[PDB]
Design a protein around this ligand. Structure first.
Ligand SMILES: [Mg+2]
Ligand SMILES: [Mg+2]
Ligand SMILES: [Mg+2]
Ligand SMILES: [Mg+2]
Ligand SMILES: [Mg+2]
Ligand SMILES: [Mg+2]
Ligand SMILES: [Mg+2]
Ligand SMILES: [Mg+2]
Ligand SMILES: [Mg+2]
Ligand SMILES: [Mg+2]
Ligand SMILES: [Mg+2]
Ligand SMILES: [Mg+2]
Ligand SMILES: [Mg+2]
Ligand SMILES: [Mg+2]
Ligand SMILES: [Mg+2]
Ligand SMILES: [Mg+2]
Lengths: 47, 105, 154, 150, 143, 97, 93, 192, 67, 64
RNA sequence: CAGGUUGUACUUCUUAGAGGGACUAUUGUGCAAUAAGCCAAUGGAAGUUUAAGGCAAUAACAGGUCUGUGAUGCCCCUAGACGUGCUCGGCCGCACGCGCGUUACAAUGACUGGCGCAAAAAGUAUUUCCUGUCCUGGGAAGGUACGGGUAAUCUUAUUAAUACCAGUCGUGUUAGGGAUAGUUCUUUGGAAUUGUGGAUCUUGAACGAGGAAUUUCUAGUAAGUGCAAGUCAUCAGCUUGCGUUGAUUAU
């Protein structure tokens, strides 16, 4: 039972923002090789 | 026969992908013998609306961007044992597709 | 109804109450409203205390009915009336309760603004100069010196 | 035959039950009541003096239809709008004093009941066997009188 | 297994939804669980009786029609409560009578009014950031 | 076929002093070559002078407007630092069916 | 008698008929029995029209006559009162 | 059986003698014979639907027309019903056979088209259409009611009633409606 | 008020006139006591179809244009 | 403003051009053909092409 | 007529997924060269490209934003700094001049009472979010008594308001209208005094439908009417949406 329950709305918006966080993180640092995108499969086990 | 009623919940940001899991989960469960499935039920499509004034600086007329994020939730019920489920969940489901499970007797 | 017997005399077009409070012939509660102190709903209260007919016209009430009101106002709290229906409550740090009379009221204010004129509080000073106190906005608000504070009908 | 409240415009029925409580004066018009205090936040104090009876009178009609309804809900359900003046009209809630009393009194009258079962609204008011019978009688009496208007 | 002798007809008008159940009997008229005589706009009540009269106390006298309506506004609901009756009386005759009797009543109503069978298509029309309402807009000083 | 990439390629060439036209040509040709169905490049900035200026280079098809716009089009844009100020580089690769 | 502000002004010089709120016992009965005096149809207005009696008063005079099986109501709404003098207006003094 | 208006007013109690108005009015149709003037119909859709509107529905519409106060047919259906009772209690006639006449009379037969050339405001002789004629008639009738109806204890159901009557009579001294009806023609007969 | 209202009906709807782009020009046929049959080309204003009936308060007219 | 985009017309023209024999005087039947016959992305657009293509069929029932 | 159940029962209502369905179809005038097309009628849930929107070409306006940006050129400041923080003021100051709007001049109305009609939105880590039942206060609001929900499961299938029936007032700047102001009480917040918001009793102004001008607006559209959502500890007279009542005139 993963800690706190969250509005599928609330948790989804959180999901998107996290993805857009990663996008700035990668693109900003991986500024050498052709960066493109990120297929992120998040599990309460492995991100 | 240790029967366990299983609840398959699927919530997703886009319809393309969530419909594949749903379509195939049933396609796969019907084909097993120890299986009893309650049709794939579609909950009401929740829509998160965000209306935004376009331009950054407040000049020029009123321009508004109506942004949407749709969330489809599908629910499937199962009559099986604990191994049966893990047998049917062996798909290759797209990213951002949350699948929750509830087990009762 | 309005089944009067002796017209011209069995009725009194104008009654005198609290100084200049002349009363109109229409309906009693409402008639009372002219008094600088009583209003729409206070009149109705009065009639329940003096068991006087409300629906009934105005002026079909003798001087007894008239005094019932003059003193009803002098020490209202005595006839009952919950402290919270009064116009004035706890004045000058001592005077318990009152019910701002037509003439009492007029001077009570003259004394409070005087209370502040000497104090020189913002709210006080404001009244002096002659400008809304709370209504704050002065740009567009009441131009051409409209009605300042404290309002009297004429 | 026989008729229930659902067969009589209650605007008409309350005009009947309001009195059945008058002649029987089984109640006792509380203090703050007569003490002028219109319901909610409005202009003038009520006009009809027995408003006290009428309110309860209908409150019974209400509970006989929507069992388990609550104070804060009936408070709303009566229907009130407020002229705030410049600011537009907003919907307004009623008065909890007169209201909660009326339920207590109807309970002492053996008409209202506090359910101690449904774990949602534990203690909400509901019609009673004896209580609801009294209603159908008034109703049927009115019902029959309407059919009597040859 | 079961199989009541019932018909299920619906009426709608700008959100107004009319659940109309028709079973054979002695002429009952339930609307949300009460007699027509008690609808809110004592006025429009007539509108609902229009179908009844337009056909004749005959068809109404033989059956028991129970309707439940929780549409949108007073006026609209009435329109649906209306539309359900009309659709149901016809719907009954389809599966429980000669398909010919249905045609009679259908044209019968159609001839008098379409709002008994047809559906008042229009709904509301969404606003626009272009102004204060659906098609009005912030003033525009030119000079 | 990846615009996000080509922009970086272009971002690199420009900082290595390769003239604009010559520059864009290489990326655009290279893009079409890889199978693009239409390619366009935009470069707003102080193009070799005072005022600002906007340079455009286009090849083959292109979907300016429609819903299919976002489907058959890839667009990435980058900022290129100069001791001048800034260079805007947009790349619109139009993917094949 | 008139202290009203910026109301007088070029236009109509129509003296407001002085309706009354009282009726003497010497006229009470006589007037109630004489409905045929206020035209065929009797509404809050007509009543005031002929008798100088304001509606509120007029109503009671109507309900009164309505009570004395002398008048019949046609329709009764907000301020619209439609009354018919049973038998027919056949009173000309 | 025949569905009377408001429950007590036979429709067949009238007929349109003049051929002009025959198709530009509602009394005549089977579909028109309504108990209530409320149809929430869909007129005003094609470019002549307005026709098929039960004449009184039109009256009610044109009646709830002043801003803030109006926009609610509910009530207006009333003001018109009472007004019909009241018109009956005076001429005891089928008040439709009254309102109807009034509609036929209060409609100007001639108007002037303002055609100005470089500052000068000239006018010409124009013959007023039927649909336009009826529209003007009702618009006019009602227009007046409010005129007096304002700060008056006289009620619309009364003002209107009193109007529909004289409007049928052509009484040029008792119908703000017919006043214009005449003047518009007169002035128009001058500009022509 | 003694008028000579000769009733005439619409024969053919010509065109629109008066840059006010609202006036309509129409060819009429009469039906009244006086004459009858006489055809005129009168100028209407308002909703008008083919075959309506209009009360002319002056048969001596018929202004016209078509360019 | 019911006019036809060039594409709509080209399609109907070329469809009729290739399958004349098979094409009927009924829209529905033809619409089915047009869909089984080629790549029409928009279901709606398909009709337009057939609705019009069907039109041409009746104009060839003339020859010119 | 309400209530409880139950059935591997059903889907009309509800949900939402597949697929249907319009294309301008059928009929006759105008066009007519063949035409593209235009009109009217009929059928139709639907014919103004069905309705409302999203997207939006080439140029350009040296339009606007460097105060949204860890996007920057140059130029400024640099420790008694234009960095950062703290306490207290201010952006709402008033003779006035403009521009959105809110409320209204009232009997097609106001006030008292009665009346199961709606939509769309939202909602928590422990009490911190929505809040139902219950208790206490005249009242705003309190209490924590009993509870559901991190949601088609719980606040809710309902708590809108206009409307409708009854009653009072009865043309009377009367109170329609509510500005201004005076004690009291209550909530948010360390703090409200230069009134946060809310309740009570008074006070009760202009306003009697508005000149020269001038803005949007053709159908579930104007208008009226309330409800949400953003902002938000608290504050809407703004904004973005939602539904109910619902028309004149054009085409
Ligand atoms: Mg009310
Ligand atoms: Mg630029
Ligand atoms: Mg009213
Ligand atoms: Mg479009
Ligand atoms: Mg652009
Ligand atoms: Mg910037
Ligand atoms: Mg410093
Ligand atoms: Mg609480
Ligand atoms: Mg809520
Ligand atoms: Mg009063
Ligand atoms: Mg107040
Ligand atoms: Mg203070
Ligand atoms: Mg305030
Ligand atoms: Mg609004
Ligand atoms: Mg909030
Ligand atoms: Mg808010």
């Amino acid at each position: 039972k993963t800690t706190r329950a969250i509005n599928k709305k609330k948790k989804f918006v959180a999901d998107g923002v996290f993805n857009a966080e990663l996008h700035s993180f990668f693109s900003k640092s991986l500024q050498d090789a052709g960066y493109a995108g990120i297929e992120v499969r998040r599990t309460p086990t492995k991100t | 026969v240790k029967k366990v009623r299983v609840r398959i919940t699927l919530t997703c940001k886009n319809l393309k992908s969530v419909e594949k899991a749903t379509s195939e989960i049933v396609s796969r469960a019907k084909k097993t013998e120890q299986v009893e499935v309650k049709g794939p039920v579609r909950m009401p499509t929740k829509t998160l609306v965000i209306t935004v004034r376009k331009s950054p600086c407040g000049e020029g007329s009123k321009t508004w961007d109506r942004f949407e994020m749709r969330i489809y939730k599908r629910i499937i019920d199962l009559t099986c044992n604990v191994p049966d489920v893990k047998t049917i969940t062996n798909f290759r489901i797209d990213p951002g597709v949350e699948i929750e499970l509830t087990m009762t007797a | 109804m309005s089944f009067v017997i002796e017209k011209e005399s069995d009725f009194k077009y104008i009654h005198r109450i609290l100084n200049t409070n002349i009363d109109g012939k229409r309906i009693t509660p409402i008639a009372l409203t002219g008094i600088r102190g009583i209003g729409r709903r206070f009149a109705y209260i009065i009639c329940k205390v003096l068991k006087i007919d409300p629906n009934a016209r105005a002026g079909l009430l003798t001087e007894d009915q008239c005094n019932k009101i003059t003193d009803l106002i002098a020490d209202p709290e005595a006839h009952g009336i919950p402290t919270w229906l009064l116009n004035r409550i706890n004045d000058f740090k001592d005077g318990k309760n009152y019910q701002m009379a037509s003439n009492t009221l007029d001077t009570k204010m003259r004394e409070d603004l005087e209370r502040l004129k000497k104090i020189k509080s913002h709210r006080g000073l404001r009244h002096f100069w002659g400008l809304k106190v709370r209504g704050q906005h002065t740009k567009t608000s009441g131009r051409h010196g409209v009605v300042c504070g404290v309002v009297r009908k004429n | 035959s026989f008729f229930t409240v659902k067969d009589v415009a209650a605007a008409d029925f309350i005009r009947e039950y309001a009195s059945h409580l008058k002649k029987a004066n089984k109640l006792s018009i509380p203090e703050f009541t007569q003490w002028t205090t219109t319901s909610v936040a409005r202009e003038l104090a009520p006009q009809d003096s027995d408003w006290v009876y009428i309110r309860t009178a209908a409150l019974a009609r209400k509970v006989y239809l929507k069992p388990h309804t609550g104070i804060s809900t009936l408070k709303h359900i009566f229907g009130s709008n407020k002229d705030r003046g410049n600011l537009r009209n907003k919907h307004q809630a009623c008065h909890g004093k007169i209201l909660r009393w009326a339920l207590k009194s109807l309970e002492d009258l053996k008409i209202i009941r506090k359910d101690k079962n449904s774990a949602t609204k534990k203690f909400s008011r509901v019609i009673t066997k004896e209580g609801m019978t009294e209603l159908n009688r008034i109703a049927t009496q009115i019902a029959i009188k309407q059919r009597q208007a040859k | 297994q079961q199989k009541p002798q019932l018909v299920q007809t619906f009426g709608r008008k700008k959100n107004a939804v009319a659940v109309a159940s028709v079973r054979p009997g002695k002429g009952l008229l339930k609307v949300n669980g009460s007699p027509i005589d008690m609808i809110n706009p004592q006025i429009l009540q007539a509108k609902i009786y229009e179908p009844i009269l337009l056909l004749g106390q005959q068809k109404f006298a033989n059956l028991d029609i129970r309707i439940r309506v929780r549409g949108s506004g007073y006026t609209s609901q009435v329109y649906a409560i209306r539309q359900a009756l009309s659709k149901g009386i016809v719907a009954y005759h389809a599966k429980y009578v000669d398909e010919n009797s249905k045609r009679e009543i259908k044209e019968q109503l159609m001839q008098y009014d379409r709002s008994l069978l047809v559906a008042d298509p229009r709904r509301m029309e969404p606003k626009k950031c272009g102004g204060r309402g659906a098609r009005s807009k912030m003033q525009k000083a030119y000079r | 076929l990846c615009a996000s990439a080509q922009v970086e390629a272009m971002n690199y060439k420009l900082l290595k002093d390769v003239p604009v036209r010559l520059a864009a040509n290489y990326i655009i040709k290279s893009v079409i070559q890889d199978g693009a169905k239409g390619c366009e490049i935009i470069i707003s900035g102080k193009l070799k002078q005072q005022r600002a200026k906007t340079m455009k280079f286009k090849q083959g098809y292109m979907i300016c407007t429609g819903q299919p716009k976002n489907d058959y089009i890839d667009v990435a844009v980058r900022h290129v630092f100069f001791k001048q100020g800034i260079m805007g580089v947009k790349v619109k690769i139009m993917l094949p069916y | 008698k008139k202290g009203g502000k910026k109301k007088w002004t070029k236009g109509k010089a129509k003296d407001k008929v002085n309706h009354a709120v009282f009726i003497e016992k010497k006229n009470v009965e006589s007037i109630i029995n004489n409905p045929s005096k206020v035209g065929k149809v009797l509404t809050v207005s007509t009543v005031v029209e002929k008798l100088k009696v304001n509606g509120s008063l007029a109503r009671q005079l109507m309900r009164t006559m309505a009570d004395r099986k002398l008048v019949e109501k046609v329709a009764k709404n907000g301020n619209q009162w439609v009354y018919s003098v049973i038998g027919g207006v056949k009173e000309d003094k | 059986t025949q569905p009377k208006l408001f429950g007590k007013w036979n429709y067949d109690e009238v007929k349109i003698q003049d051929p002009c108005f025959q198709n530009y009015i509602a009394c005549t149709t089977t579909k028109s014979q309504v108990f209530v003037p409320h149809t929430a119909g869909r007129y005003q859709v094609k470019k002549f639907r307005k026709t098929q509107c039960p004449i009184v529905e039109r009256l009610i519409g044109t009646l709830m027309f002043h801003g803030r106060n109006a926009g609610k047919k509910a009530l207006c259906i009333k003001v018109v019903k009472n007004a019909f009772e009241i018109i009956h209690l005076v001429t005891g006639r089928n008040p439709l056979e009254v309102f109807v006449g009034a509609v036929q009379n209060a409609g100007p037969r001639e108007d002037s088209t303002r055609i100005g050339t470089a500052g000068v405001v000239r006018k010409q002789a124009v013959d007023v259409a039927p649909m336009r004629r009826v529209n003007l008639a009702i618009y006019f009738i009602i227009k007046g009611c409010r005129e007096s109806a304002f700060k008056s204890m006289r009620s619309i159901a009364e003002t209107l009633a009193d109007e529909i009557i004289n409007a049928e009579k052509n009484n040029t001294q008792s119908s703000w409606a017919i006043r214009k009806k005449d003047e518009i023609e007169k002035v128009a007969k001058g500009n022509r | 008020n003694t008028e000579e209202t000769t009733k005439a009906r619409i024969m053919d709807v010509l065109g629109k006139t008066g840059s006010r782009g609202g006036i309509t020009q129409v060819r009429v046929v009469l039906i009244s006591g006086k004459e009858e049959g006489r055809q005129l080309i009168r100028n209407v204003k308002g909703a008008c179809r083919v075959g309506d009936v209009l009360e002319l308060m002056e048969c001596e007219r018929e202004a016209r244009r078509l360019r | 403003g019911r006019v036809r985009t060039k594409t709509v017309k080209r399609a109907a023209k070329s469809l009729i051009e290739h399958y004349y024999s098979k094409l009927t005087n009924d829209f529905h039947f033809n619409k089915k053909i047009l869909s089984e016959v080629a790549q029409v992305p928009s279901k709606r657009l398909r009709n337009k092409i057939a609705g019009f293509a069907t039109h041409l069929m009746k104009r060839i029932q003339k020859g010119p």
